[PDB]
């Protein structure tokens, strides 16, 4: 290839960081540790992939360049550009099977693999499209991503639901014990549609958001384009639970309390909870919440807090990590909890906003 380009170091760093995102540490095939570089019509394109998702970055070329393509080791190329001085001019060209990188009197020769061998995600057609602010998408994901399963046997839970309904985009994430749902109006009449994005893809999309975000959804893929970055991922094929069925039906108990005071009380009680099961006991009556935690060493923590409470006295158990995850995600003043009994789910939300809702299933104590 006759590929050649010269670009300032600072125009390459974020593109390189972004496209190395899909790349896992131990690639099965050597090419999968590489980035695809392509020079065409005044643009340098950089692509990184793990076969399930890909990230593409486009860099404008104002200095002399020649068209062509090659693949180079991602981490080595990034480290070289990063390690060069601020303001360095990075000259790249091919010399047989090597890619030569030159700046000042620093010279690097990287091994390449043919561009023709680089994998491409199969051709696909978009069937749903919409645009929204990148911060709105980031908020939708941030509000719910901690509730995704990690490596659950129920593959469809190891990801996030993206659902359009009326004028809202909604994200739902659950691991079967706790659930998070967040809706945001996006100002367009949308078709009712729902897809599951794999968790690795959700994390990658979240990391690309910092320009509007253009989203395209196909039968088996999702694409997000923002600025000079394009992210594409395969979707998870399966049926996602219905959050509407999970929300507590007729909660007869309502608790309100300060978010930080609740979170610090749960965090101290957690210290003396069972390291494996993480169970804490909530006793609520007479506008007082008592949190107790015991462990196999027979140690005990007890926190008493003033709360606003309506409903019968009740004792209910929770995995303290699930509660702390919810309180950490709600970065608010007051939280509202809606309960029914010791064996039923509890709904938690910001006392002042209904945009996000969290459902936590209790444990027996």
């Amino acid at each position: 290839s006759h590929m050649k380009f010269t670009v300032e170091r600072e125009h390459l760093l974020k593109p390189l960081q972004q496209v190395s995102g899909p790349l896992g540490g131990r690639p099965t095939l050597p090419i999968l540790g590489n980035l695809l570089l392509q020079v065409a019509d005044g643009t340098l394109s950089l692509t990184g992939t793990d076969l399930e998702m890909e990230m593409v970055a486009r860099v404008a070329l104002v200095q002399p360049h020649e068209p062509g393509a090659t693949t180079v080791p991602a981490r080595k190329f990034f480290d070289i550009c990063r390690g060069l001085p601020e303001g360095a001019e990075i000259a790249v060209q091919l010399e047989g099977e090597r890619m030569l990188v030159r700046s000042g009197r620093s010279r690097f020769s990287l091994s390449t693999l043919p561009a023709a061998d680089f994998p491409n995600l199969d051709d696909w057609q978009s069937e749903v499209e919409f645009t929204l602010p990148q911060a709105t998408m980031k908020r939708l994901i941030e509000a719910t991503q901690f509730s995704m399963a990690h490596q659950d046997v129920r593959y469809y839970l190891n990801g996030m639901l993206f659902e359009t309904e009326g004028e809202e985009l909604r994200t739902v994430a659950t691991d079967g014990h706790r659930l998070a749902v967040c809706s945001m109006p996006i100002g367009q009449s949308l078709p009712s549609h729902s897809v599951i994005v794999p968790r690795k893809g959700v994390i990658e999309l979240m990391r690309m958001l910092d320009n509007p975000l253009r989203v395209q959804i196909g039968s088996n893929n999702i694409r997000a384009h923002v600025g000079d970055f394009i992210f594409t991922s395969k979707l998870v094929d399966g049926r996602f639970p219905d959050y509407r069925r999970v929300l507590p039906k007729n909660p007869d108990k309502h608790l309100e309390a300060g978010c930080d005071l609740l979170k610090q009380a749960f965090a101290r009680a957690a210290i003396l909870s069972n390291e494996k099961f993480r169970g804490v006991r909530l006793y609520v009556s007479e506008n007082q919440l008592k949190i107790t935690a015991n462990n196999p060493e027979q140690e005990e923590a007890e926190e008493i807090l003033d709360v606003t409470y309506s409903g019968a006295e009740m004792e209910i158990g929770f995995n303290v990590s699930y509660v702390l995850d919810v309180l950490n995600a709600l970065k608010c003043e007051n939280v509202r909890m809606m309960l029914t009994d010791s064996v039923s789910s509890v709904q938690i939300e910001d006392a002042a906003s209904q945009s996000a809702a969290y459902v936590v299933m209790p444990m027996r104590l």
Binding site: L179, P241, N319, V343, M361
Partner: peptide, 5 residues
């Protein structure tokens, strides 16, 4: 730990 669904 009880299940949501």
């Amino acid at each position: 730990q009880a299940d949501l669904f």
